[model samples]
Target: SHGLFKKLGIPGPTPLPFLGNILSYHKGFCMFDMECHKKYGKVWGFYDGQQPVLAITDPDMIKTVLVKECYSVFTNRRPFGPVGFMKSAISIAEDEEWKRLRSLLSPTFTSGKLKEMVPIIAQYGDVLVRNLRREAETGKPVTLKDVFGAYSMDVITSTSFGVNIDSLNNPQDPFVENTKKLLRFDFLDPFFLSITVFPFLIPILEVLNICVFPREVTNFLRKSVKRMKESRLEDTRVDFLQLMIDSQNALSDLELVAQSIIFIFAGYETTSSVLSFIMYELATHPDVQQKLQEEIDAVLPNKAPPTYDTVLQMEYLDMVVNETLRLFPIAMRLERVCKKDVEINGMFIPKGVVVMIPSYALHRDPKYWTEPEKFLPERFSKKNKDNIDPYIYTPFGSGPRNCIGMRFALMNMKLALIRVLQNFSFKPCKETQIPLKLSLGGLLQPEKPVVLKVESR
Candidate 1:
């Protein structure tokens, strides 16, 4: 709630009494954000059920709060709430807790740590190719969303649960069904909005056991963690679950469960969606696809399994993946709460104002890129990448709050793309959504069957 009570005269839509703009903006949130930026300029104010939300597309102002790692100034995550224990994960954890959790978890994402997990991730890539091959054999269109999401689920289970459930091929697996259900809900739902807009209700919601993490989903992860600990994966297999187990003395049961659930939802959903979009972009651009394939062939020529170090050597593959992120950053917006009074460009933003960075609009601003909409991988080429403005492009975010999974996620995507392109080529069929109209829900998503035609090369 960026300066929800302040009278800064920041321009935005007019609001009604208690409803504010919820009734008007509840449906179609993706388009709502875009239209808001269009109608109300970069830095404008709007009310969400009587709470103020300042959405901005400006870069410099966003950087100040996002970077600096200053908890004293911007501690709360807007309405980073307590409706669910899931919110307590580092992504939205509040005050000193957020800092401590972030510091503790940071070790899991270092390049050294991530490299150890590459084979585990790449093994799933092989499973994915097999699954795609089976789909192509039926000559049926495959919605890469479900397939890709499931692949990510398999990877997360291995990384997070320290065991594999074979979710990519098993249609009824709890991870498959639950994860989809998890992503199905809206961040602006009445219940979430109430808890978020008026945070005072959080303790009440928690007392009633009202939480965003679903029962079945929570049970699945809970039992997995408990069972894994009791039956425990051998020390020979080092994974996130193992790492967490080692730190049990430091984390409460609630905190441990919250972090594991976030890994499933955050790592699986965002990484899978990223792959879905990247596939869509590559399918539409044959020239780009061929170039990427050429690079993959050179590195893992026989479609031989990719290794951690060698996969990192493919600079062109990195460029193609980076460009796709620029055009379609999954979480189109970012938020921060102003902990102290501050002024920006002659405007007074009093303490507790929640700052928003509309990356969806920020990335597309003409000033940031030579051609923002077009799929020009060259724009991210070695030399060109250096020229990009610091805050202009934040796919994983920027500064202290940037995604911890950035390295792992990037490696995961590159590994999967290399394996798939080596064996098959993704092409648009009659059913492909031209111009790829985004799904009406949840952080730039796609369909039940995010279908694309595939052929084994």
Candidate 2:
């Protein structure tokens, strides 16, 4: 029965049988979760059709679920849809397999390994500033979305896939074109809706060899990765694929491609949008922008590039980055599947239910942040940061299963910002939206083009 929450004394929005509160997501998930949190308090219940979900945003509750008993009771994200080529993606891979892959892949992102990647990423930053200067010279508003998308593609491909292509110079390149096609998913498509209504059809779709991702694009990516893996089996290169290829008996050929896809998906859109959001805030807030520019100018004097260690030392820049992420977390939801029925404090979590951490909602919760809507970087300053509850402010998430690419992402983002701020300044243009409106889609992205005037310093 749909009386699951009422029976358990957990309050939430009343669900419609079969459809189960799915319509409430019309305002988008971030707003939806915020509304639910206000209405139902800390521990609440909702459903995605037949499956019940628990949205636990309480600090202690989250700590218990994601950290304290993570390995024992909640170990995996809920599995949904046809996983065709994503069979080995760490985000969805289960149990012993996840542990095996996580252990094998963890070494590649260590500080020492990422430190070596700084020179490689700085080269891309130089190209990005050069390209942006050309756009700025044109005397028109620059679209940060398109610009950063191409830049992020170049960086991820060169670093993760071991391929070198200038997507900034050649936007029509097949790799860029196919990746653009692959990343855009119409969440409201009738096919997806039907599957959501009938959960059992997921296995049927899998058995029938149906792929939720564009089949042609998926195959193209798989074939390209396979080709690269075969050629690099014995060659030495300083990239992620090379590191993975050197590992003995670690991943099957197809699994290698799956992980590469995950890297691109995780690293690409999220990083680009975050950069765009930062620029938008900088453009809108001149005081914040000027203060940050001073920090960058002081840190990297005489046009020197930022190394891994140097970027770490820019305290004000770090505050700005942290503040932007607090407002616009890349992944809207952090999810885990309950492996068995468990109770924490007075809340009972039943087996096989999905436990969701509404990251967007939590980041803006009034209880945790003062003046949460304002753009204030000082909250993250060393003096005040200690007061923040770590469990509540998780842009990159927390716990062992947190984002493996977090350090790599922060390094690249800061590197690019340093170079760009050194040479240019962003100001709000007529085309810029006063208060940005975000899309109702899954990710936290601007609804319209984030157009701003770029002036060379």
For each candidate, what TM-score against the reference? 0.91, 0.96
Indicate the residue-level lDDT of 17 in model 1.
Answer: 70
Write model 1 residue lDDT over 235-300, tens digit each, in one string: 445456666667775877777777877887886788888898889889999999999999889988
lDDT of 1 at 7: 57
Clash pairs of candidate 1? 2-354, 3-353, 73-339, 142-451, 143-449, 143-450, 143-451, 144-450
Q: What is the lDDT of residue 92 in candidate 1?
A: 68
TM-score of 2: 0.96
Clashes, model 1 = 8
Native-to-model Cα distance after best TM-score fit, residue 421 in candidate 2, in Å: 0.7
lDDT tens digits by residue: candidate 2, 31-104: 99999898888878998887788998878889888888888988898776777768788877888889888887
Error of 1 at 300 (Å): 1.8
| Model 2 ranges off by over 4 Å | 183-186, 233-238
